[PDB]
Amino acid sequence: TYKYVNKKEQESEVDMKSATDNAARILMWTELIRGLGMTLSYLFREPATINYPFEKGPLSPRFRGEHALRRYPSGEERCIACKLCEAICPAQAITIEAEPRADGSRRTTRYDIDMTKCIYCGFCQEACPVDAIVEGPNFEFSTETHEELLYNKEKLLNNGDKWEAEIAANIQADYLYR
Amino acid sequence: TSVKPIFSRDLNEAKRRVRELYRAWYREVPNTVHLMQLDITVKQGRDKVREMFMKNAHVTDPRVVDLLVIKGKMELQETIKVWKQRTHVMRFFHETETPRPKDFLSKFYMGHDP
Amino acid sequence: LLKKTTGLVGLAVCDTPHERLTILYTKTLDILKHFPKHAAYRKYTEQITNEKLDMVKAEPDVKKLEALLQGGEVEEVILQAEKELSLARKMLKWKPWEPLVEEPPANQWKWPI
Amino acid sequence: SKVKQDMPPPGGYGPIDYKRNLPRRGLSGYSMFAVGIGALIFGYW
Amino acid sequence: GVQVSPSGEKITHTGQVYDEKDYRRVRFVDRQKEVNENFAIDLIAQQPVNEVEHRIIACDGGGGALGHPKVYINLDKETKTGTCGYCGLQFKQHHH
Amino acid sequence: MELVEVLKRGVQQVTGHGGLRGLLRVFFRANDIRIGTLVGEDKYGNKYY
Amino acid sequence: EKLLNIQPPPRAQWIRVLFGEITRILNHIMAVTTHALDIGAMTPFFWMFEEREKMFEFYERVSGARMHAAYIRPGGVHQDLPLGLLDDIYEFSKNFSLRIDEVEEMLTNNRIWRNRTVDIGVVTAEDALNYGFSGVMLRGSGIQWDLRKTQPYDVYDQVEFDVPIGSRGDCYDRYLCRVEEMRQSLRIIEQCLNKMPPGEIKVDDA
Amino acid sequence: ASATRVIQKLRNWASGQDLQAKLQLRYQEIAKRTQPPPKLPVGPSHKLSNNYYCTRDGRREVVPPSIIMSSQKALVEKKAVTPAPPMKRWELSKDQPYL
Amino acid sequence: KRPTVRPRSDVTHKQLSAFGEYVAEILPKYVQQVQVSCLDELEICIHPDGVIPTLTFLRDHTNAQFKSLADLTAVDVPTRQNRFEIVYNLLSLRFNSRIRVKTYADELTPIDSIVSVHIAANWYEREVWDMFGVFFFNHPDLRRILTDYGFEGHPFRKDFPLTGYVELRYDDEVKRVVAEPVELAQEFRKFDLNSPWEAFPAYRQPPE
């Protein structure tokens, strides 16, 4: 079905009262006055402005922020150097090198994420089979040089150690959906 | 070995179109140097135009010559109507790019690229 | 009555839609008689034009004529008829009833490679 | 356990207005012309 | 644990450290080379060996779906504990 | 009326930040003088309302 | 999905239609308000961008990204809706038509806006068809065409809505068409909220 | 929502609309930020029998396109046809045909 | 019936097959192949000489009325003699249908432009020329539309590298934005994501 947005049906003819109403509308600027009144109502409303940085906009546990590498509760790294995140990364922002550790464990020797190349899509955290790489909810990590956004394994493990109290709670609140 | 022509039946009128395009470039070079504030002289611009034509001078296929003329006319129009900027015009000179030497000893000292 | 507007921008109302469709269809048939007898385009266009001319001669009312034609507004039908006439002229010039001009290469339409 | 999912309430959601709703306000043209003419006459006097 | 080079630079858990004559320490001049202090190899060495009764144990890292994929470790060798290939936890069969 | 109630809320917002010094501190740091329930305070000294 | 010969589950299709209509509201908000900003009025831009912020909150709550969700995927959607999202969508949509009425009061009957938009950029229907226009341009020129009605996809054949059609082919008619199809998108949003079915999220094909 | 009745009446008169019924600021009607855990349902293929993949392999039912005529394979009174029946005219809306 | 498989209607396939026969017998001079996909889409593969008559017939015929060109594009398959497959997707609002018309070209045989048939073909053919190097005869103004000014090469070709040959940077000695031969700090790592096992037996090509 369809409807007309501007087509008028029949005519209203001509009347002295209607002509006087249109004359008053043209001369006394009635629609302009009611536009003024609308802006006046908005003036006397309450603004929708939060007091940043003391107030923050609401988010969800699903929010994709700064990357981090998590651990098991024992303290062992969750990552097993399987390169699924590297394979699924649409921007090729992940570089992984690996070798057996001194105890024979399958661990990374290089895990780099170019955050200037990353598109913050969460494909790494949804392809990780052991929940090692995550996008924790940090978003206020802007730097002053281009280099500081080239994360390596030490930076990502430090982020995982810093944000574990929040990332674990978000994964607890979210993991039944995924 | 028999193909459909684009514009030229053989090489003669293809070379005629090449000469017309070279004439248009030769006339347009001083206007470009005056309009875009170019450091180069009029002699250098015409030398560059001649260098580009002589770079393409080795072809003997009329269709390829016609397509080269079409491309040259497109670039000529991009220079006539000021769509190429000073950077786009000066990209023909490669003045910031050091040239790779053509001798075996220098290529041996530089790296593994032949 | 008379249609106030066609509902489309730039499409003026035709005061006499029946005779305009009649003359367009007759001119189309007259130029279709110049086509070769074995031309499939001639046969199909004659079928379409004859059916539309038959219903435009049968129905004198514009609304029921539009319902029979199923081509939107009768002004759209007139526009389609004159475009068909121009296409008939162009196709007579082009002569596409001739055999295939050139075979494609063997793997031109082979997908996947 | 029971399947828990994001679903509408069993009674459905309430009606959502979507039509254009202008208040159709203001006084008549005769009344405002009369007010203006009366202001003119009083000011002239 | 974090060890220092003869240059004084911290050695990472991958064993990476720049040499004394390596020019790339100038990126750490007037800045810091940050090294993750908690070494996962030492942390997983600190875990006690889980003493189970069955010949085959199942490990998922704990937390169920929050852990690693569930694998089965065969504790037949009495001279060596069975290590989970994902989480690094060690298990030993109790034969008493 | 309600204007006097708004003025009561305003004077309690003014005299609800400790003293004049506390009011000036919160007004020139946060640009806000709203009174909220103290949810907590972290180990670094941030107060949460 | 057409290349794969697979179909998403009905709950996924309903979610996709609901978020398509939310996205249509977002895009028409941007179009109308930034058009009005280019004309010279910015207060509808500010109001409707607060509304855009609320819809971005919906996007972040379903996907974790406010704009580039990567949520709708071949086979359905990435995740199920979190609990309470449908209630919050209802709470947003039950108040939104007033905001549209606010912008319409600000602009539609304004003689300045009518002078700026009426008989500007008039496109005839035949010219629009030949130039290959689609969507708002054709319907502003008066062509009764909408892909959701003619070649429907997902559950657009199950929802019910009207198609705004212009009659003069100008900026004013296109603006009216965009506002009216914002209202129709709100209508479809109400239908999707009432008729959201239970079930899975991706196609059951690993 | 903290506006006085005088300011509320002023805003409602100035806008022409009852603004207090539909506020653009969310106060309490929204969902709680903490929710009970869900339990998502499983799809139709989550069954332990009569669920062979060859019977639901839609991806492998794709066939190469059927050649209606070919210049090499075929080596080549009926009515004229259309790609489809002509599109039915849209009915005017019974809800609100005109603005 | 099956919840994971797309439903299939045979009426659209029958109608498109009938219309393909119709167009093929109307224009035997140019039509080389007519096919209907299992996705119910009609494709007509024609000789490059018949682009103008075929497009004009499809736009202006009473039973076709494909008055809207959906898009015009090219596909580079560099294993045939005519590597560029030019594709026209067209929409008929009168009959609520879509058709696809294909033709072929190589680097040195231009095809006729259809700007005189559809005006959108102007920018579409500009894009095709800019991205593939397929010249178009009788174009009103053919030039680049998406590449940079003075860009050499047609980047949507298969043999053109993904990163290109030049990159821009601001040089302070000349105070300009200059073009250099491309050097990457990290090379694009190509992946061999092809299973060595056949996935679709219906598309098994016979051995050579």
Ligand code: SF4
């Ligand atoms: S969020 Fe996406 S782009 Fe970023 S590292 Fe993960 S997979 Fe790569």
Ligand code: SF4
């Ligand atoms: S997907 Fe996870 S386990 Fe695999 S390499 Fe990446 S972070 Fe490590």
Ligand SMILES: [Zn+2]
């Ligand atoms: Zn384990």
